[PDB]
Amino acid sequence: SPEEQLLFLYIIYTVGYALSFSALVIASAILLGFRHLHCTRNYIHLNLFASFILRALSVFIKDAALKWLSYQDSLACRLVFLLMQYCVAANYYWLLVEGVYLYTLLAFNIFEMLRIDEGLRLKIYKDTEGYYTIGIGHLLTKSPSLNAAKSELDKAIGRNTNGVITKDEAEKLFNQDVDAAVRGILRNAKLKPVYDSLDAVRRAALINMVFQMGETGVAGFTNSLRMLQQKRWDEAAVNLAKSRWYNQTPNRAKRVITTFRTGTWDAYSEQWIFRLYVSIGWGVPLLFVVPWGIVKYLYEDEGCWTRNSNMNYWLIIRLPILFACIVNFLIFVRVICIVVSKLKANLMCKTDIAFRLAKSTLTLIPLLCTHEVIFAFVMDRFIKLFTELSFTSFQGLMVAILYCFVNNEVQLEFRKSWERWRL
Ligand SMILES: CC1(C)CC([C@@H](Nc2ccc(-n3cnc(C(F)(F)F)c3)nc2)c2ccc(C(=O)NCCC(=O)O)cc2)C1
Protein backbone atom coordinates (compact mmCIF):
# COMPACT_ATOMS: atom_id res chain seq x y z
CA SER A 1 0.00 0.00 0.00
CA PRO A 2 1.18 3.55 -0.68
CA GLU A 3 -0.33 5.08 2.49
CA GLU A 4 0.92 2.20 4.67
CA GLN A 5 4.53 2.49 3.44
CA LEU A 6 4.64 6.26 4.06
CA LEU A 7 3.27 5.79 7.57
CA PHE A 8 5.61 2.99 8.64
CA LEU A 9 8.78 4.87 7.70
CA TYR A 10 7.41 7.78 9.82
CA ILE A 11 7.10 5.48 12.81
CA ILE A 12 10.68 4.31 12.56
CA TYR A 13 11.91 7.91 12.16
CA THR A 14 10.14 9.32 15.19
CA VAL A 15 11.01 6.39 17.43
CA GLY A 16 14.56 6.76 16.14
CA TYR A 17 14.67 10.31 17.47
CA ALA A 18 12.66 9.37 20.58
CA LEU A 19 15.19 6.69 21.51
CA SER A 20 18.06 8.98 20.43
CA PHE A 21 16.87 11.87 22.59
CA SER A 22 16.14 9.72 25.63
CA ALA A 23 19.52 7.99 25.41
CA LEU A 24 21.57 11.17 24.78
CA VAL A 25 19.96 12.93 27.73
CA ILE A 26 20.65 9.96 29.97
CA ALA A 27 24.25 9.87 28.68
CA SER A 28 24.86 13.58 29.15
CA ALA A 29 23.30 13.16 32.63
CA ILE A 30 25.87 10.49 33.38
CA LEU A 31 28.81 12.53 32.09
CA LEU A 32 27.62 15.47 34.21
CA GLY A 33 26.61 13.69 37.43
CA PHE A 34 29.74 11.64 38.09
CA ARG A 35 32.59 13.92 39.10
CA HIS A 36 35.32 11.67 37.73
CA LEU A 37 34.02 12.08 34.19
CA HIS A 38 34.75 15.85 34.09
CA CYS A 39 37.40 16.07 31.35
CA THR A 40 37.82 17.89 28.01
CA ARG A 41 37.04 14.81 25.92
CA ASN A 42 33.70 14.29 27.60
CA TYR A 43 32.97 18.04 27.51
CA ILE A 44 33.36 17.91 23.71
CA HIS A 45 30.98 14.95 23.78
CA LEU A 46 28.46 16.96 25.75
CA ASN A 47 28.63 19.60 23.04
CA LEU A 48 28.16 16.88 20.42
CA PHE A 49 25.22 15.40 22.39
CA ALA A 50 23.76 18.87 22.60
CA SER A 51 23.92 19.21 18.83
CA PHE A 52 22.09 15.87 18.51
CA ILE A 53 19.55 16.65 21.26
CA LEU A 54 18.78 20.02 19.73
CA ARG A 55 18.40 18.40 16.35
CA ALA A 56 15.92 16.04 18.06
CA LEU A 57 14.04 18.96 19.59
CA SER A 58 13.64 20.44 16.11
CA VAL A 59 12.24 17.12 14.93
CA PHE A 60 9.67 16.98 17.77
CA ILE A 61 8.70 20.66 17.45
CA LYS A 62 8.05 20.40 13.74
CA ASP A 63 5.92 17.35 14.52
CA ALA A 64 3.84 19.05 17.25
CA ALA A 65 3.22 22.04 14.96
CA LEU A 66 1.30 19.82 12.56
CA LYS A 67 -1.45 19.99 15.19
CA TRP A 68 -3.50 22.89 13.78
CA LEU A 69 -2.89 29.78 7.02
CA SER A 70 -0.94 26.51 6.77
CA TYR A 71 2.24 25.48 8.61
CA GLN A 72 4.45 25.46 5.50
CA ASP A 73 3.46 29.14 4.96
CA SER A 74 4.23 30.13 8.56
CA LEU A 75 7.51 31.79 9.59
CA ALA A 76 7.80 29.68 12.76
CA CYS A 77 8.46 26.61 10.56
CA ARG A 78 11.19 28.35 8.60
CA LEU A 79 12.78 29.20 11.98
CA VAL A 80 12.68 25.60 13.29
CA PHE A 81 14.19 24.40 10.01
CA LEU A 82 17.01 26.96 10.38
CA LEU A 83 17.65 25.68 13.90
CA MET A 84 17.75 22.13 12.58
CA GLN A 85 20.13 23.01 9.74
CA TYR A 86 22.31 24.72 12.34
CA CYS A 87 22.32 21.54 14.44
CA VAL A 88 23.22 19.50 11.38
CA ALA A 89 26.26 21.62 10.61
CA ALA A 90 26.97 21.59 14.41
CA ASN A 91 26.88 17.79 14.24
CA TYR A 92 29.31 17.78 11.33
CA TYR A 93 31.58 20.38 12.88
CA TRP A 94 31.65 19.02 16.44
CA LEU A 95 32.51 15.89 14.51
CA LEU A 96 35.30 17.85 12.80
CA VAL A 97 36.60 18.86 16.23
CA GLU A 98 35.96 15.31 17.41
CA GLY A 99 38.35 14.32 14.63
CA VAL A 100 40.87 17.08 15.38
CA TYR A 101 40.88 16.30 19.11
CA LEU A 102 41.53 12.65 18.30
CA TYR A 103 44.42 13.56 15.98
CA THR A 104 46.21 15.77 18.48
CA LEU A 105 45.52 13.27 21.29
CA LEU A 106 47.52 10.82 19.16
CA ALA A 107 50.17 13.51 18.56
CA PHE A 108 50.77 14.50 22.19
CA ASN A 109 53.05 12.05 24.01
CA ILE A 110 55.74 12.17 26.69
CA PHE A 111 58.12 14.01 24.28
CA GLU A 112 55.67 16.91 24.07
CA MET A 113 54.92 16.88 27.85
CA LEU A 114 58.61 17.11 28.79
CA ARG A 115 59.37 19.79 26.15
CA ILE A 116 56.71 21.89 27.94
CA ASP A 117 57.89 21.21 31.48
CA GLU A 118 61.64 21.20 31.03
CA GLY A 119 62.08 24.06 28.59
CA LEU A 120 64.89 24.39 26.08
CA ARG A 121 68.39 25.76 26.47
CA LEU A 122 70.95 26.54 23.77
CA LYS A 123 73.91 27.35 26.10
CA ILE A 124 75.07 25.65 29.28
CA TYR A 125 73.55 27.10 32.48
CA LYS A 126 74.45 26.71 36.20
CA ASP A 127 71.09 25.80 37.85
CA THR A 128 70.05 26.65 41.42
CA GLU A 129 70.97 23.30 42.90
CA GLY A 130 74.44 23.40 41.32
CA TYR A 131 73.85 21.26 38.20
CA TYR A 132 74.79 22.46 34.73
CA THR A 133 71.89 21.92 32.36
CA ILE A 134 71.37 22.33 28.61
CA GLY A 135 68.92 21.14 25.93
CA ILE A 136 65.64 19.75 27.28
CA GLY A 137 66.14 18.99 30.99
CA HIS A 138 69.58 17.41 30.51
CA LEU A 139 71.54 17.78 33.71
CA LEU A 140 75.21 17.15 33.25
CA THR A 141 77.14 16.96 36.54
CA LYS A 142 76.87 18.90 39.77
CA SER A 143 80.67 19.45 39.73
CA PRO A 144 81.13 23.30 39.99
CA SER A 145 83.25 23.69 36.84
CA LEU A 146 81.99 25.14 33.53
CA ASN A 147 85.10 24.00 31.67
CA ALA A 148 84.50 20.37 32.72
CA ALA A 149 80.75 20.62 32.08
CA LYS A 150 81.43 21.72 28.51
CA SER A 151 83.84 18.81 28.08
CA GLU A 152 81.35 16.39 29.73
CA LEU A 153 78.84 17.57 27.19
CA ASP A 154 81.33 17.25 24.31
CA LYS A 155 81.76 13.51 24.90
CA ALA A 156 77.96 13.21 25.19
CA ILE A 157 77.42 14.99 21.86
CA GLY A 158 80.47 13.94 19.88
CA ARG A 159 81.80 17.13 18.34
CA ASN A 160 83.28 20.05 20.29
CA THR A 161 80.59 22.01 22.10
CA ASN A 162 82.09 25.50 22.60
CA GLY A 163 78.99 26.16 24.69
CA VAL A 164 76.31 26.61 22.03
CA ILE A 165 74.44 23.47 20.93
CA THR A 166 72.00 23.25 17.99
CA LYS A 167 68.29 22.33 18.15
CA ASP A 168 68.80 18.95 16.46
CA GLU A 169 71.56 17.94 18.85
CA ALA A 170 69.29 18.77 21.80
CA GLU A 171 66.42 16.67 20.37
CA LYS A 172 68.87 13.77 19.97
CA LEU A 173 70.02 14.05 23.63
CA PHE A 174 66.34 14.45 24.68
CA ASN A 175 65.41 11.18 23.02
CA GLN A 176 68.38 9.66 24.85
CA ASP A 177 67.15 10.85 28.22
CA VAL A 178 63.62 9.60 27.62
CA ASP A 179 64.75 6.10 26.60
CA ALA A 180 66.84 6.16 29.77
CA ALA A 181 63.78 7.14 31.80
CA VAL A 182 61.62 4.32 30.61
CA ARG A 183 64.44 1.79 31.01
CA GLY A 184 64.86 3.18 34.53
CA ILE A 185 61.22 2.55 35.33
CA LEU A 186 61.29 -0.99 33.92
CA ARG A 187 64.59 -1.72 35.70
CA ASN A 188 62.86 -0.58 38.92
CA ALA A 189 61.11 -3.25 40.99
CA LYS A 190 58.61 -0.77 42.49
CA LEU A 191 57.93 1.20 39.31
CA LYS A 192 57.50 -1.59 36.71
CA PRO A 193 54.32 -3.24 38.14
CA VAL A 194 52.61 0.08 38.58
CA TYR A 195 53.91 1.32 35.19
CA ASP A 196 52.61 -1.87 33.50
CA SER A 197 49.28 -1.44 35.23
CA LEU A 198 49.01 2.22 34.08
CA ASP A 199 47.46 3.37 30.77
CA ALA A 200 49.65 5.32 28.32
CA VAL A 201 48.72 8.71 29.73
CA ARG A 202 49.36 7.95 33.39
CA ARG A 203 52.42 6.12 32.06
CA ALA A 204 53.70 9.45 30.66
CA ALA A 205 52.83 10.96 34.06
CA LEU A 206 55.18 8.51 35.76
CA ILE A 207 57.91 9.01 33.12
CA ASN A 208 57.74 12.73 33.79
CA MET A 209 58.54 12.41 37.51
CA VAL A 210 61.42 10.05 36.69
CA PHE A 211 62.76 12.64 34.23
CA GLN A 212 62.79 15.28 36.96
CA MET A 213 63.79 13.28 40.07
CA GLY A 214 65.13 9.90 38.90
CA GLU A 215 64.14 6.22 39.19
CA THR A 216 65.44 5.75 42.73
CA GLY A 217 63.80 9.01 43.86
CA VAL A 218 60.21 8.61 42.67
CA ALA A 219 60.41 5.04 43.92
CA GLY A 220 60.23 6.66 47.35
CA PHE A 221 56.55 7.46 46.97
CA THR A 222 55.57 4.12 48.46
CA ASN A 223 52.35 5.45 49.91
CA SER A 224 51.16 6.82 46.55
CA LEU A 225 52.40 4.13 44.15
CA ARG A 226 50.42 1.47 45.99
CA MET A 227 47.10 3.29 45.59
CA LEU A 228 47.98 4.15 41.97
CA GLN A 229 48.20 0.41 41.26
CA GLN A 230 44.88 -0.14 43.13
CA LYS A 231 43.31 2.28 40.59
CA ARG A 232 42.33 4.74 43.42
CA TRP A 233 43.33 7.93 41.62
CA ASP A 234 41.78 10.53 43.91
CA GLU A 235 43.18 9.06 47.11
CA ALA A 236 46.67 9.18 45.61
CA ALA A 237 46.21 12.72 44.32
CA VAL A 238 45.76 14.24 47.81
CA ASN A 239 48.61 12.03 48.97
CA LEU A 240 51.05 13.41 46.37
CA ALA A 241 50.28 16.99 47.48
CA LYS A 242 51.67 16.16 50.95
CA SER A 243 55.07 15.67 49.31
CA ARG A 244 58.47 17.30 49.22
CA TRP A 245 58.13 17.24 45.45
CA TYR A 246 54.91 19.23 45.62
CA ASN A 247 56.37 21.91 47.88
CA GLN A 248 59.63 22.15 45.92
CA THR A 249 58.20 22.58 42.37
CA PRO A 250 54.39 22.97 42.74
CA ASN A 251 53.33 24.13 39.27
CA ARG A 252 54.99 21.09 37.68
CA ALA A 253 53.63 18.81 40.42
CA LYS A 254 50.00 20.00 39.96
CA ARG A 255 50.07 19.15 36.22
CA VAL A 256 51.48 15.69 36.87
CA ILE A 257 49.17 14.86 39.79
CA THR A 258 46.18 16.00 37.70
CA THR A 259 47.40 13.66 34.95
CA PHE A 260 47.47 10.81 37.46
CA ARG A 261 44.06 11.79 38.84
CA THR A 262 42.25 12.15 35.53
CA GLY A 263 44.15 10.15 32.91
CA THR A 264 44.05 12.97 30.38
CA TRP A 265 46.46 15.62 29.11
CA ASP A 266 44.22 18.40 30.40
CA ALA A 267 46.86 19.91 32.68
CA TYR A 268 49.10 20.45 29.60
CA SER A 269 46.08 21.66 27.60
CA GLU A 270 45.92 25.40 26.91
CA GLN A 271 42.56 26.84 28.06
CA TRP A 272 42.19 28.80 24.82
CA ILE A 273 42.02 25.74 22.53
CA PHE A 274 38.94 24.35 24.20
CA ARG A 275 37.57 27.77 23.48
CA LEU A 276 38.55 27.60 19.76
CA TYR A 277 36.86 24.16 19.62
CA VAL A 278 33.60 25.31 21.23
CA SER A 279 34.09 28.23 18.72
CA ILE A 280 34.56 25.88 15.66
CA GLY A 281 31.93 23.29 16.65
CA TRP A 282 29.31 25.97 17.37
CA GLY A 283 30.73 29.12 15.78
CA VAL A 284 31.72 28.27 12.21
CA PRO A 285 28.30 26.65 11.70
CA LEU A 286 26.95 30.10 12.39
CA LEU A 287 29.27 31.39 9.67
CA PHE A 288 27.56 29.58 6.78
CA VAL A 289 24.09 28.65 8.18
CA VAL A 290 22.87 32.19 8.80
CA PRO A 291 23.78 33.74 5.37
CA TRP A 292 21.90 30.71 3.84
CA GLY A 293 18.87 31.51 6.02
CA ILE A 294 19.08 34.99 4.50
CA VAL A 295 19.32 34.10 0.80
CA LYS A 296 16.59 31.55 1.51
CA TYR A 297 14.42 34.07 3.22
CA LEU A 298 15.22 36.70 0.60
CA TYR A 299 15.90 35.03 -2.74
CA GLU A 300 14.28 31.58 -2.34
CA ASP A 301 11.38 31.71 0.14
CA GLU A 302 8.97 28.91 -0.84
CA GLY A 303 7.26 26.40 1.49
CA CYS A 304 9.64 26.53 4.46
CA TRP A 305 12.47 26.63 1.87
CA THR A 306 12.20 22.95 0.97
CA ARG A 307 11.90 23.70 -2.77
CA ASN A 308 15.63 24.39 -2.49
CA SER A 309 16.57 24.01 -6.16
CA ASN A 310 17.24 27.08 -8.25
CA MET A 311 20.71 28.58 -8.12
CA ASN A 312 23.99 28.71 -6.11
CA TYR A 313 22.17 29.02 -2.76
CA TRP A 314 22.11 25.22 -2.15
CA LEU A 315 25.91 25.04 -2.34
CA ILE A 316 26.62 27.39 0.51
CA ILE A 317 25.37 24.95 3.15
CA ARG A 318 26.48 21.82 1.31
CA LEU A 319 30.00 22.90 0.38
CA PRO A 320 31.08 23.87 3.91
CA ILE A 321 29.62 20.54 5.06
CA LEU A 322 31.25 18.96 1.99
CA PHE A 323 34.53 20.55 3.01
CA ALA A 324 34.25 19.18 6.56
CA CYS A 325 33.64 15.66 5.20
CA ILE A 326 36.62 15.81 2.88
CA VAL A 327 38.87 16.74 5.77
CA ASN A 328 37.16 14.34 8.12
CA PHE A 329 38.11 11.67 5.58
CA LEU A 330 41.64 13.00 5.13
CA ILE A 331 41.69 12.93 8.92
CA PHE A 332 40.00 9.54 8.74
CA VAL A 333 42.93 8.51 6.46
CA ARG A 334 45.82 9.93 8.39
CA VAL A 335 44.51 8.65 11.73
CA ILE A 336 44.49 5.03 10.59
CA CYS A 337 48.12 5.02 9.47
CA ILE A 338 48.74 6.59 12.88
CA VAL A 339 46.93 3.82 14.74
CA VAL A 340 48.49 1.10 12.58
CA SER A 341 51.94 2.49 13.36
CA LYS A 342 51.17 2.92 17.06
CA LEU A 343 49.75 -0.58 17.45
CA LYS A 344 52.45 -2.16 15.23
CA ALA A 345 55.10 -0.23 17.21
CA ASN A 346 53.27 -1.45 20.43
CA LEU A 347 53.22 2.28 21.31
CA MET A 348 49.47 2.12 21.82
CA CYS A 349 47.51 -0.83 23.20
CA LYS A 350 43.85 -1.39 22.42
CA THR A 351 42.87 -0.77 26.08
CA ASP A 352 44.08 2.87 25.86
CA ILE A 353 41.80 5.88 25.38
CA ALA A 354 43.32 7.21 22.18
CA PHE A 355 42.50 3.90 20.52
CA ARG A 356 39.05 3.46 22.08
CA LEU A 357 38.20 6.95 20.79
CA ALA A 358 39.49 6.22 17.30
CA LYS A 359 37.17 3.17 17.34
CA SER A 360 34.12 5.44 18.02
CA THR A 361 35.21 8.47 16.03
CA LEU A 362 36.43 6.67 12.91
CA THR A 363 33.14 4.78 12.87
CA LEU A 364 31.01 7.92 12.91
CA ILE A 365 33.07 9.86 10.30
CA PRO A 366 32.02 7.65 7.34
CA LEU A 367 28.61 6.67 8.83
CA LEU A 368 27.99 10.40 8.84
CA CYS A 369 30.03 11.91 5.97
CA THR A 370 30.14 9.15 3.43
CA HIS A 371 26.73 9.75 1.87
CA GLU A 372 27.55 13.47 1.78
CA VAL A 373 30.66 12.57 -0.22
CA ILE A 374 29.18 10.07 -2.73
CA PHE A 375 26.36 12.16 -4.03
CA ALA A 376 28.82 15.00 -3.97
CA PHE A 377 27.20 17.39 -6.50
CA VAL A 378 23.70 15.82 -6.88
CA MET A 379 20.62 17.94 -6.03
CA ASP A 380 18.02 15.14 -6.19
CA ARG A 381 13.36 3.00 -6.49
CA PHE A 382 11.76 5.46 -4.08
CA ILE A 383 11.14 3.09 -1.12
CA LYS A 384 14.89 2.37 -1.14
CA LEU A 385 16.28 5.86 -0.45
CA PHE A 386 13.58 6.23 2.18
CA THR A 387 15.84 4.17 4.41
CA GLU A 388 18.45 6.95 4.60
CA LEU A 389 15.84 8.67 6.86
CA SER A 390 16.05 5.75 9.32
CA PHE A 391 19.82 6.07 9.62
CA THR A 392 19.83 9.80 10.37
CA SER A 393 17.09 9.40 12.97
CA PHE A 394 19.02 6.89 14.97
CA GLN A 395 22.25 8.80 14.46
CA GLY A 396 21.73 10.53 17.82
CA LEU A 397 21.14 7.23 19.65
CA MET A 398 24.27 5.73 18.06
CA VAL A 399 26.50 8.55 19.37
CA ALA A 400 25.32 8.05 22.97
CA ILE A 401 25.80 4.31 22.59
CA LEU A 402 29.29 4.80 21.15
CA TYR A 403 30.33 7.80 23.25
CA CYS A 404 28.88 6.85 26.62
CA PHE A 405 27.05 3.54 27.11
CA VAL A 406 29.81 1.25 25.77
CA ASN A 407 32.54 3.54 27.18
CA ASN A 408 34.59 1.69 29.79
CA GLU A 409 35.06 4.66 32.12
CA VAL A 410 31.35 5.22 32.82
CA GLN A 411 30.72 1.53 33.50
CA LEU A 412 33.41 1.66 36.16
CA GLU A 413 31.64 4.72 37.63
CA PHE A 414 28.30 2.83 37.85
CA ARG A 415 29.78 -0.27 39.52
CA LYS A 416 31.89 1.86 41.87
CA SER A 417 28.84 3.68 43.28
CA TRP A 418 26.56 0.65 43.58
CA GLU A 419 29.40 -0.72 45.69
CA ARG A 420 29.42 2.51 47.71
CA TRP A 421 25.73 1.79 48.32
CA ARG A 422 26.37 -1.73 49.62
CA LEU A 423 29.20 -0.41 51.83
C1 LIG B 1 27.96 -0.51 14.44
C2 LIG B 1 29.37 -1.08 14.63
C3 LIG B 1 29.43 -2.60 14.55
C4 LIG B 1 30.39 -0.41 13.74
C5 LIG B 1 31.02 0.23 14.96
C6 LIG B 1 32.42 -0.18 15.15
N1 LIG B 1 33.30 0.74 14.42
C7 LIG B 1 34.72 0.45 14.31
C8 LIG B 1 35.29 -0.58 15.05
C9 LIG B 1 36.65 -0.80 14.90
C10 LIG B 1 37.39 -0.01 14.04
N2 LIG B 1 38.82 -0.25 13.89
C11 LIG B 1 39.47 -1.31 14.32
N3 LIG B 1 40.75 -1.20 14.02
C12 LIG B 1 40.93 -0.05 13.38
C13 LIG B 1 42.25 0.50 12.84
F1 LIG B 1 42.35 0.20 11.51
F2 LIG B 1 43.29 -0.08 13.51
F3 LIG B 1 42.28 1.85 13.01
C14 LIG B 1 39.68 0.56 13.30
N4 LIG B 1 36.82 0.96 13.35
C15 LIG B 1 35.53 1.20 13.46
C16 LIG B 1 32.77 -0.12 16.66
C17 LIG B 1 32.80 -1.29 17.41
C18 LIG B 1 33.11 -1.24 18.76
C19 LIG B 1 33.39 -0.03 19.36
C20 LIG B 1 33.73 0.03 20.85
O1 LIG B 1 34.08 -0.95 21.41
N5 LIG B 1 33.62 1.28 21.57
C21 LIG B 1 33.94 1.33 22.99
C22 LIG B 1 35.29 2.02 23.20
C23 LIG B 1 35.17 3.27 24.07
O2 LIG B 1 34.49 4.25 23.68
O3 LIG B 1 35.76 3.32 25.19
C24 LIG B 1 33.35 1.14 18.61
C25 LIG B 1 33.04 1.09 17.26
C26 LIG B 1 30.06 -0.53 15.85
Residue numbers in the entry: 136 to 203, 218 to 257, 1001 to 1160, 261 to 372, 380 to 422
Quote the authors verbatim.
GLP-1R belongs to the class B family of G-protein-coupled receptors (GPCRs), a group characterized by a 120–160 residue folded extracellular domain (ECD) followed by a canonical transmembrane domain (TMD). One class B GPCR, the glucagon-like peptide-1 receptor (GLP-1R), has been considered as an anti-diabetes drug target and there are several peptidic drugs available for the treatment of this overwhelming disease. The widely accepted two-domain binding model suggests the ECDs of class B receptors recognize the C-terminal helices of their hormone peptide ligands, thus facilitating binding of the N-terminal region of the peptides to the TMDs for downstream signaling. Wild-type TMD of GLP-1R (residue range 128–431) is extremely unstable as suggested by size-exclusion chromatography (SEC) and thermal-shift assay. We have previously described that ten thermal-stabilizing mutations were introduced in the TMD structure of GLP-1R in complex with two negative allosteric modulators (NAMs), PF-06372222 and NNC0640, and we showed that a di­sulfide bond (I3175.47bC—G3616.50bC) and a GCGR mimicking mutation C3476.36bF are indispensable for crystallization.
